[PDB]
From TrEMBL, chain A:
Full protein stretch here: 212 to 316 of 526
Highest taxon in the source lineage: Viruses
Protein name per UniProt: Portal protein
TrEMBL record, chains B, C, D, E, F, G:
Protein name: DUF1320 domain-containing protein
Length: 105, 137, 137, 137, 137, 137, 137
């Protein structure tokens, strides 16, 4: 269960890192020199942070999905592992399946 | 000045330049420098029309392909009357096709002698980039 | 210099080079080296125009196909007047088609003598890759 | 060297090779080995241009179809002037069509003598494959 | 060797094979076995080019349609100069059309003498199939 | 053997078969059985090429339409040189069109004498069918 | 046997049948019954090829349109050489068009003498129909 939780947490952290801006790919026509290639690459690299930009009509930039999903699978795995650990360590009556409130003699 | 009188003579021989440039003497005797200069200037103006959107205008160096194109256009301009099927007209059309291909980003402007040309900053422009909270605070 | 005077002589025989290069003597007697050099330079400039976007300009080696293309274009350039149905013009058009196919990534630039050419880094560019949390911490 | 002088003689008879190769003697007397070598080299360069993206360049063996294609292209290259309706030009065009079909993955490069050619690793590439948790732990 | 000299003689008569194969004697006297062998080899190489992607190369048996195609292509190859409107060229084109139809899976390679040819395992490939929990446990 | 020498004689008269089959005697005197056999075999091979994907190869009976098609193709094969506008060529093309229509499932192979031909099991294949819980338990 | 010798004589006159059927006597004297029988059989085979998918093969009765089509095809088959612009060829093409229209379900096979033809059960097939709980229980 520890390894399962570790893998789930690391994967969730990576997916949160990728989340945000989309991946966008620039295309250039034949006869584009290396300096123009570097300029296009820097423009694409900074385009996500930069609201606006201009390119020649002969070029093209396509915004592709980056990472679309949810945290539901990761969190489900973490909860499963944590419940397993709680049951194994302290029993499945008070920690994992908590006994809830309720007083009395 | 992407081409000179020497380039025209070398490409088309001095006899043809004399024949198409001397308009006052029959038979021709000398090459009129003013007419050749005007033809070369017109060729350069057309080439700049084609190249203004991708490179700086006052080029500090002349690429070799630019020299060939300028020579061809200048020779085509030295003809007072130029019909459609004249081979010189066809050569001018091919050179104009090369220029259009360069303008539309299908051909690259080659080396001048050893270094690259100077492209304009048209593609460089981006807004600026606002990325606070990502500067290792 | 993808081709030399020796290559032109070998491909088209010395007689034809003499005939199309000697413009001052009738009948021709010698091959004008300056005219041949200019024609070869123009062919190289056109080829560089076609190849600038995929390979480095100052190639350290000349691929054989490049030699054939340069020889053909140089010979076509040595004709002051070239009509549409002239077979040399058709050969030049076929070679230009080969060059365009190379530029559009449909043909590859072959071996020079034993090693590959040097493609440019146009396709290499990627942002950088941010993958913290995945470095075996 | 996908074809040799022996192959050219066998395919087109020694008389025709002598006639199209001897440029200095009229009538022809001997076959010029240098001209034939250059023509064969040019044919090989074109074929490599067509085949560079699917197979290794320095082929250790020559497939038979490659021999026929090289012979045809070499013979077509031995003509200083080649018109459009010349049947040799049509044969060269058909062979170029075969080469293009091979390049576009519509035709396969046949056996050399008994074994297959050596395709390049272009299609092999995949990322690597991350499949932890599936290794019988 | 999908066809032999006997097949060529039977299909086109010995006189025509002698006429198109003897290049050194005028009038022809004997059939040159080397030239016929090379033509047949070239026809086989083209056919293998067309059939490599669907069947094994070193076929242990020769289907009859393959014999007819090889004979036609070999005869077409024995002509040094072959024009477009020559009927032999048209027959070669029809046979090439048959080969292309076979390659594109529109025609099947027929019986050799009594058994089927040997198709390649190109279509066989599937991953493997993971179906645990379905093995009558 | 979808057709025999008797069928060819009946369809095209014995004189024409003699004329197109006897290649060594001028004028013709006898019908060469070997040449006719090879032509019929080639016609059968082409027909099998067309019919392999829908019926079994070694047909136990010959449908009448198959006899007509085989006779036409065999006669067309007995011509060493066959031009495009020759009516026999047009008849062969029509018969090939009929064969292609049969292959593409637009025409059915007719009765042989009283019973149907034997189609292949290509369409029969289905997985197997898992329908437990539906067997009247 | 959708048509007989009497039908051919009635449709095309006995003289024309004699002329196109007697191949051994010049001028013709008698009608060869074997040749006419083979031509009629070939016409019937083609018609069955066209009609196999919609009706039973061994038709017990011959529709009148079928008689006309068979007569036309049989007469067209009695010509050893038939050019494209021959009117008999055009009539055969029109009849084949009628047959194709019948096959594609655009024309119906008419009455034989008073009753309908016998269509095949191709359209009849349905699974079976499971409709328990709807049988007035």
């Amino acid at each position: 269960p520890y390894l399962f939780r570790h893998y789930a947490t690391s994967d969730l952290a990576e997916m949160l890192e990728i989340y945000g801006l989309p991946i966008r790919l620039g295309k250039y026509p034949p006869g584009t020199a290396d300096e123009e290639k570097a300029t296009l690459l820097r423009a694409v690299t900074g385009l996500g942070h930069a609201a606006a930009g201009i390119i020649p009509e002969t070029m093209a930039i396509d915004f592709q999905q980056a990472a679309q999903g949810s945290s539901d699978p990761f969190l489900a795995m973490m909860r499963q592992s944590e419940d397993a650990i709680s049951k194994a360590v302290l029993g499945g009556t008070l920690t994992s399946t908590t006994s809830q409130s309720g007083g009395g003699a | 000045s992407y081409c000179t009188l020497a380039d025209l003579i070398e490409q088309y021989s001095e006899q043809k330049i004399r024949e198409v440039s001397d308009r006052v003497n029959k038979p021709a005797t000398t090459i009129d420098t003013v007419i050749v200069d005007r033809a070369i200037a017109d060729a350069d103006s057309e080439i700049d029309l084609h190249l203004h959107g991708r490179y700086q205008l006052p080029l500090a160096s002349v690429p070799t392909a630019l020299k060939r194109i300028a020579c061809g256009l200048a020779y085509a301009n030295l003809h007072i009357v130029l019909k459609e099927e004249n081979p010189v007209y066809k050569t001018a059309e091919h050179l104009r096709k090369l220029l259009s291909g360069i303008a539309n980003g299908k051909l690259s402007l080659a080396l001048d002698a050893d270094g690259k040309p100077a492209p304009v900053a048209n593609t460089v422009q981006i807004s600026e980039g606002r990325n606070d909270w990502g500067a290792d605070w």
